[PDB]
Symmetry: C2
Subunit: 267 residues, 2 copies
């Protein structure tokens, strides 16, 4: 049919690389977010009681990082403006899609060497990674950064990929918690923004939507900036739940159980 032994039997397809269209659909797997704007309009700020040494430590530290990234970002002194907004979120998103990758592949590597059913935790992480990496590809179209923060970005990732690698190895409960808490704040970040556009204390100017984003979230032809944040928000909020649950499941020794969220595909 479309794809069979005749292709399979050919040494290379290097000839067709000049002659395939860049599709913006091709930028992500076929696993897209598909919220309904009026609904995810209601997504709320939540908080989960830290349930021990680790949960609190995950909490504490996430909260000093916001402190230290808030002062250093300078995000602190001035208005909520599309600039230091896109600029902020953009940066965060470089780190935002790291945990999902290092988790998924660690579970992949367990599975492979101990020959066990992963029961679908892999893929759910591997999407969080892609999903945020997409969040990136969006923002990296509203406003490219400058050399100063392009560097900063490439040094942060170096540092973060050790932290998450070693920690995810030491305590996955710690990391899913750690991440749980970075989400809650991802909500707050974005949700406070939706409230600027609402209150008019910020007047968006990128009110089309990057084509990348528009297909991804099946966004309408002249969907506005706000609409965009609402899904970017929903996305995040889902990551919230999941990463506290995955952690709660580690809490009660369940890191080798069926992944709840597979079920919630039209169950």
């Amino acid at each position: 049919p479309v794809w069979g032994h005749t292709q399979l039997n050919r040494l290379s397809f290097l000839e067709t690389v000049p002659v395939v269209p860049l599709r913006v659909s091709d930028e992500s797997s076929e696993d897209r977010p598909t919220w309904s704007l009026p609904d995810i309009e209601n997504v709320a700020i939540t908080h989960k009681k830290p349930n021990g040494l680790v949960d609190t430590l995950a909490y504490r530290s996430v909260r000093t990082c916001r402190w230290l990234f808030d002062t250093f970002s300078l995000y602190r002194f001035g208005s909520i403006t599309e600039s230091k907004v896109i600029s902020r979120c953009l940066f965060l998103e470089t780190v935002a899609g790291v945990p999902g990758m290092v988790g998924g592949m660690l579970r992949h590597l367990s599975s492979l060497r101990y020959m066990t059913r992963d029961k679908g935790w892999i893929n759910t992480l591997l999407v969080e990674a892609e999903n945020e990496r997409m969040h990136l590809m969006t923002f990296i179209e509203l406003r490219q950064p400058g050399l100063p923060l392009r560097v900063s970005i490439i040094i942060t990732q170096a540092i973060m990929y050790l932290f998450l690698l070693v920690a995810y190895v030491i305590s996955p409960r710690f990391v899913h918690r750690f991440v749980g808490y970075l989400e809650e704040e991802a909500v707050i970040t974005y949700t406070g923004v939706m409230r600027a556009i609402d209150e008019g204390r910020l007047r968006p100017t990128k009110n089309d939507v990057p084509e990348v984003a528009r297909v991804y979230w099946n966004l309408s032809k002249n969907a506005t900036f706000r609409d965009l944040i609402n899904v970017i928000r929903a996305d995040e909020a889902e990551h919230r739940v999941v990463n506290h649950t995955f952690a709660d499941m580690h809490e009660k020794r369940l890191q080798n159980s069926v992944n709840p969220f597979v079920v919630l595909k039209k169950n």
Copy 2:
């Protein structure tokens, strides 16, 4: 419903006891769709190398193939069904590792360069899945002894590490190594089918595991050979994708679109 409701919950921990163990959820919905009498004719090819790098990959595949078949005493002994099943149980545990660094290193770069990737990552990923869906399938035909169970852990450390540092240095080398790897895979799985067909091997196992039913999509009637035939297809799917990839690299096209996104679909 997957609405702000469930998004606003704290945790769904409490929900595990109710959710079923649906074999269909081990993998992503991205499933090799082969048509068997079609794929049947999957041939054994041999890509000519260019670089010294290609040469190297080729020797390092040869060398490991000799190493393995010897220390595994797979060469002689009246070829058994339960040494095919084992050798693939081991080999698909290494197999499931490069595609996964593959997709990981590329992944990270899209985020540190805030650049597009153009369909590479999800391909390299689902490979690492596909090679894992072999492993979970084989395990059902035979559980590894403690010798073997030990072998796979030690080997994961050598390999992973090796891949990881070859990936940073020579992406070309990895893609072409895998290519050549899979040129062997495809040799062996047609060997098996051939061996089966001349009744040199009589397949005691004909309960095709559920996992390989739902994942590959196959009637409850699909014989042992039917499995070998689909798996072997993927192995050749991997053989020419990674071999396209090594070529793509060698031609500074790392950042060109990944062609196989379109050869999913109909025309260009």
